[PDB]
Amino acid sequence: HHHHHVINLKELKILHTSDWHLGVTSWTSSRPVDRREELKKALDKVVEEAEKREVDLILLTGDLLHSRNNPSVVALHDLLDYLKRMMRTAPVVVLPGLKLFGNFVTSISSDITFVMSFEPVDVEAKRGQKVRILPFPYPKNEGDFRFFLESRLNKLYEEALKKEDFAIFMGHFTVEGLAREIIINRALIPSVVDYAALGHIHSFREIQKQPLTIYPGSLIRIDFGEEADEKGAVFVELKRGEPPRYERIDASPLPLKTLYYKKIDTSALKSIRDFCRNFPGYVRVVYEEDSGILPDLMGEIDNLVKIE
């Protein structure tokens, strides 16, 4: 199953997913929970939607592995497993959050490209579309730093002007003013790209519409700051005549809940027990004062991962 070659094809379907954090175990200081099974389920749903929609290109951004430096064999084997699966559907371009194995794999394949530098790369998509990738990976400096970054973005704008069909910006950074980190103003994302695929933020954000610029988010709620979050992937469709459209692919991951109390008194105990009873995800209790020896709530309630 190799690529198609359709004359005058003026469209491109993209799956963009990000920030998988393969290998994460949560709440290791209170109650370790291995998130793999939930994550593999979320990823499977993303793989199946990609197949279902017959996408042309899959973009992966952000931290696909939880461990900055020392991913486990399982985490690595899961990554390569899902990479392979995706490459069966459509070509995969990865902007990382080893340089050796990435460069080698890109050489020997026509369906995975690791963009490991600031240099543009042209890729071929599932139906023969030509796509120019403008990458902005994580890069000592201080305010010359800002001028460095800005110089790099300017170069990518010029290289984007040299596109044949589609141009796609990929970046691993924090958009200034979100509501060491690399902080970059959204106005400096080259305006002449058709899509800007961003990663590193766990939460789905539509940053702007022109160029359409999106963080898809993580696929699980990694910690309690993510309880109100949208988790999933994004499906983007590009057509030469027209504005880009996109649909969120929800990963439907386990819900999180933080229950708050001054003291864990009689009423707070009943509140906690009732709530967790049939709650299908994980619960945190936040309280302020000790008032006696606390009952063994974690032995009693398997969903409760943190009192603290």
Swiss-Prot record:
The chain holds residues 1 to 324 of 385 of the full protein. Keywords: DNA recombination, DNA replication, Endonuclease, Exonuclease, Hydrolase, Metal-binding, Nuclease. Changing H172S: Decreased endonuclease activity. The gene is mre11. Part of the Rad50/Mre11 complex, which is involved in the early steps of DNA double-strand break (DSB) repair. The complex may facilitate opening of the processed DNA ends to aid in the recruitment of HerA and NurA. Mre11 binds to DSB ends and has both double-stranded 3'-5' exonuclease activity and single-stranded endonuclease activity. Nuclease activity is regulated by Rad50. The mirin-derivative PFM39, specifically inhibits the 3'-5' exonuclease activity. The N-alkylated mirin-derivatives PFM03 and PFM01 specifically inhibit the endonuclease activity. Belongs to the MRE11/RAD32 family. Mn(2+) 1 binds at D19, H21, D63, H202. GO terms for molecular function: 3'-5' exonuclease activity; DNA binding; DNA endonuclease activity; DNA exonuclease activity; metal ion binding. Homodimer. Forms a heterotetramer composed of two Mre11 subunits and two Rad50 subunits. Homodimerization facilitates DNA binding. It comes from Thermotoga maritima (strain ATCC 43589 / DSM 3109 / JCM 10099 / NBRC 100826 / MSB8). This is DNA double-strand break repair protein Mre11. Its cofactor is Mn(2+). GO terms for biological process: DNA recombination; DNA repair; DNA replication; double-strand break repair. Mn(2+) 2 binds at D19, D63, H172, H200. Its EC number is 3.1.-.-.
